[PDB]
Amino acid sequence: SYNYAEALQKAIYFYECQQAGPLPEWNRVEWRGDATMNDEVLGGWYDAGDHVKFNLPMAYSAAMLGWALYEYGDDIEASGQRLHLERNLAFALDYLVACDRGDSVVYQIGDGAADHKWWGSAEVIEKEMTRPYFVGKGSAVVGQMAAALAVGSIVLKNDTYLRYAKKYFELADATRSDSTYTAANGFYSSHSGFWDELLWASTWLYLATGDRNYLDKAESYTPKLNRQNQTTDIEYQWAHCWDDCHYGAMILLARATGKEEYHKFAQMHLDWWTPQGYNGKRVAYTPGGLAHLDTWGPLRYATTEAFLAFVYADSINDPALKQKYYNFAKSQIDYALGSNPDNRSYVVGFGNNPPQRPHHRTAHGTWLDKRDIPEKHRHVLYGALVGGPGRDDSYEDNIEDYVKNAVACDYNAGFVGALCRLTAEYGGTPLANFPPPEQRDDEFFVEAAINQASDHFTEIKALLNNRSSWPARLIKDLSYNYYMDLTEVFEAGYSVDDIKVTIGYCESGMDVEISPITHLYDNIYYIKISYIDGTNICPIGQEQYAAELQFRIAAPQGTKFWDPTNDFSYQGLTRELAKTKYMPVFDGATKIFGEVPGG
């Protein structure tokens, strides 16, 4: 129906867009550089369109990429995506290992409230704020970390991952409490409690080790799971998700043990998701055929259930059930890819009419802590599955819509697994030469205006800009030059000594020096304006993205020879600020923008 191989290729690439510093050598994202290098634990993924590392959804997302490989790794070698998926997973699992603090873990980097108040690119956030870390022993977060490491140890054949999976499971199982999990409250609160994480983790530890003691633990947790409403059934009217993986765990146990209780649960849960429902009860469906669990990330929930449904259908023999679940699964993935009332992809950079304004700071590429400028994203967030449409299939591509245009690690995770299943079956050719290079705009440049002209002086207002985005970055040794032709000065009988440079305004906190008038060649001379710590010119807000200086170059009062019209840097200037290529910008001795007299 779609090129599922290309979709898979892009959905994996999304994770490279999310990587915190230091980036691996293989990172393919031209607009990403090392970022948040002062974080207490390095690497891992930024969670969503923000810069917080939230370990619960991060570990969940890793666990799901691990599960994708566990089911379909061999079946996707043809797509060419297996190696990409494996090393992207490893990057996250390495972070989880790096969080170990013995009887506790670092479970969050960054404060949600503080992070979210600011809109700008990852690489420059340390100029805006100082990022905290959080330590604890929450059973849900630690349990999920264990699960991700357990499946990761299988698929990546890695004994360190297994050792840490065991460590974290033991901690979580000994703690049996979410009370020390607080930093993510209101963002990723533990809603279901922790017994489902202990189930998920112990199940994966059993699949990793074959040690029946884990299967014993797993089966011991099921009576502690939340019930459906006031009945005795285990809750089934929700999705497998970052908060609650008992759904997937029961499917794994159905296949691993063959026991009827797990098959019963799997069928009741999946029937509730399908259009036929479960004895008169069913998830809400949009008229366009999307199973729509909640306002937040309906595509995430539906595509995750697609993966579970594929796995369960592949694991049973009953042809009616297999077809019902397979059809459900493929219908949800296909909706996401364009089988909907608008015939449009909800995967950024893929298919017909994809979203172009995902709620994502670093892909947007602002310089002034606004969402509306630039009006178009500077970068392509390939592969990101957006939140998706409302309950009635309605949708508008709007950066302000942090619900419908949300993107996140957990949104892509189950989706990757389902795309693995579909490319396994239908093939498809991934894109060669992916990703293609982006059109860039000017990043470092001066905007200048004639602040005042006089028969004896020129006064310039000059803003040295850092609107960098490929990647956003900091340059310390910034300077620019203003070139003049002094022929008229010498013809009048005057000298360079008779020309005075003064300052009429210099922006607070921008340490600046202006050189003496310096000879270039012939009658061409210049001044250099140097910012000693140019990293303070940075795309983090209205005040910081440019440093303003007003400088005056003056012959003596009363003289009538001054001619700015033959000065190279005056060319094209008006009374309104405008970018000029004739006041070139330098990083140390290297010219990075503009032109010099005589080329």
Ligand X SMILES: OC[C@H]1O[C@@H](O[C@H]2[C@H](O)[C@@H](O)[C@H](O[C@H]3[C@H](O)[C@@H](O)[C@H](O[C@H]4[C@H](O)[C@@H](O)[C@H](O)O[C@@H]4CO)O[C@@H]3CO)O[C@@H]2CO)[C@H](O)[C@@H](O)[C@@H]1O
**Site residues (vs a copy of itself, CB under 8 A):** 500-513, 532, 550, 552, 554
Query: Which residue number, 50 or 244, has a Cβ lying nearer to Cl ion?
Result: 50
235 is an interface residue for Ca ion by CB under 5 A: no
104 is an interface residue for Br ion by CB under 5 A: yes
Residue nearest to Ca ion (CB): 192
Query: Which residue number, 329 or 546, has a Cβ lying nearer to a copy of itself?
Result: 546
104 binds, options ligand X, Br ion, a copy of itself, none, Cβ within 5 to 8 A by partner type: Br ion
Check residue 30 and report its DSSP letter: T
CA–chain centroid gap for 299, Å, is 18
Token match 């990403």: residue?
32
297 binds, options ligand X, Br ion, Cl ion, none, Cβ within 5 to 8 A by partner type: ligand X
596 binds, options a copy of itself, Cl ion, ligand X, none, Cβ within 5 to 8 A by partner type: Cl ion
Taking CA atoms, 578 is separated from 157, 292, 373, 461, 484, in Å, by: 58, 49, 17, 10, 19
Binding mask 120-139 for Br ion (x = CB under 5 A): ----------------xx--
Query: Which residue number, 54 or 247, has a Cβ lying nearer to Br ion?
Result: 54
The region, left, alpha or beta by phi > 0 then psi within -120 to 50, assigned to residue 165 is: alpha
Taking CA atoms, 515 is separated from 373, 501, 596, in Å, by: 35, 9, 17
Which range touches ligand X (CB under 6 A), out of 86-94, 152-160, 212-220, 236-244?
Answer: 236-244
Which range touches ligand X (CB under 6 A), out of 121-129, 241-249, 517-525, 580-588?
Answer: 241-249
501 binds, options Br ion, a copy of itself, ligand X, none, Cβ within 5 to 8 A by partner type: a copy of itself
Terminal Cα-to-Cα distance of the chain (whole angstroms): 55
Tokens at residue 94, please? 């390495």
- For residues 151-180, which are near Br ion according to CB under 5 A? 180
599 binds, options Br ion, a copy of itself, Cl ion, none, Cβ within 5 to 8 A by partner type: Cl ion
Q: 109-140: string of b/e by CB count within 10 Å (b at 16+)?
A: bbbbeebbebbbbbbbbbbbeebebbebbbbb
508 binds, options a copy of itself, ligand X, Cl ion, none, Cβ within 5 to 8 A by partner type: a copy of itself
Check residue 536 and report its DSSP letter: G
- Is the CB of residue 325 less than 8 Å from the CB of residue 251? no
Which range touches Ca ion (CB under 5 A), out of 195-203, 211-219, 368-376, 447-455?
Answer: 195-203
Which range touches ligand X (CB under 6 A), out of 15-23, 187-195, 329-337, 470-478?
Answer: 187-195
Which range touches ligand X (CB under 6 A), out of 185-193, 205-213, 277-285, 549-557?
Answer: 185-193
Three-class SS of residue 222? Answer: helix
- For residues 237-256, which are near Ca ion according to CB under 5 A? 244
265 is an interface residue for ligand X by CB under 6 A: no
191 is an interface residue for ligand X by CB under 6 A: yes
Check residue 570 and report its DSSP letter: G
Minimal distance in Å, beta carbon 449 to Br ion? Answer: 45
Q: Which residues contact 159 (CB under 8 A, 6 or more apart)?
A: 153
Beta 518-521 vs 457-466: how paired, if at all?
unpaired
DSSP string, 157-191: T-HHHHHHHHHHHHHHHHH---TT--TTTTTS--S
Minimal distance in Å, beta carbon 489 to a copy of itself? Answer: 18
Query: Which residue number, 72 or 526, has a Cβ lying nearer to Ca ion?
Result: 526
244 binds, options a copy of itself, Ca ion, Cl ion, none, Cβ within 5 to 8 A by partner type: Ca ion
Token match 């972070």: residue?
95
Crossing angle of helices 159-175 and 82-98, in 10° steps, is 50
Strand partners, 36: none
Q: How many residues bind ligand X (CB under 6 A)?
A: 18
Distance, CA of 168 to CA of 393 (rounded, Å): 41
Tokens at residue 394, please? 């309605």
Minimal distance in Å, beta carbon 235 to ligand X? Answer: 6
- Is the CB of residue 393 less than 8 Å from the CB of residue 59? no
Three-class SS of residue 10? Answer: helix
Q: How many residues bind Cl ion (CB under 5 A)?
A: 16
Q: Compute the C-alpha angle 191/113/540, nearest 5°.
A: 145
188 is an interface residue for ligand X by CB under 6 A: yes
Query: Which residue number, 85 or 514, has a Cβ lying nearer to a copy of itself?
Result: 514
Which range touches Cl ion (CB under 5 A), out of 110-118, 273-281, 458-466, 565-573?
Answer: 273-281
Query: Which residue number, 237 or 535, has a Cβ lying nearer to Ca ion?
Result: 237
- For residues 395-414, which are near ligand X according to CB under 6 A? 406, 408
Query: Which residue number, 92 or 408, has a Cβ lying nearer to ligand X?
Result: 408
Q: What is the H or E stretch that residue 73 is in? A: none
Count other C-beta atoms under 10 Å from residue 284's C-beta.
Answer: 11
Minimal distance in Å, beta carbon 346 to Cl ion? Answer: 13
Among 76, 85, 96, 140, binds Ca ion (CB under 5 A): 140
155 is an interface residue for ligand X by CB under 6 A: no
Which range touches Ca ion (CB under 5 A), out of 191-199, 378-386, 444-452, 497-505?
Answer: 191-199
Tokens at residue 559, please? 């003289």
Distance, CA of 548 to CA of 8 (rounded, Å): 47
Distance, CA of 296 to CA of 302 (rounded, Å): 12
Q: Nearest CA to 251 among 238, 262, 264?
A: 262
Which range touches Cl ion (CB under 5 A), out of 6-14, 355-363, 440-448, 487-495?
Answer: 355-363
Minimal distance in Å, beta carbon 395 to ligand X? Answer: 15
Tokens at residue 272, please? 């509730």
Query: Which residue number, 213 or 295, has a Cβ lying nearer to ligand X?
Result: 295
Give start and end residues of each alpha helix (H) in 133-259.
139-155, 159-175, 195-209, 212-221, 246-257
- For residues 98-117, which are near ligand X according to CB under 6 A? 112
274 is an interface residue for Cl ion by CB under 5 A: yes
189 is an interface residue for Ca ion by CB under 5 A: no
Strand partners, 499: none
Q: Which residues bind Cl ion (CB under 5 A)?
A: 274-276, 324, 356, 373-375, 377, 380, 431, 434, 436, 595-596, 599
Residues that bind ligand X (CB under 6 A): 48, 50, 112, 187-189, 191-192, 226, 235, 238, 241, 243-244, 296-297, 406, 408
Interface contacts to Br ion, rule CB under 5 A: 104, 136-137, 180
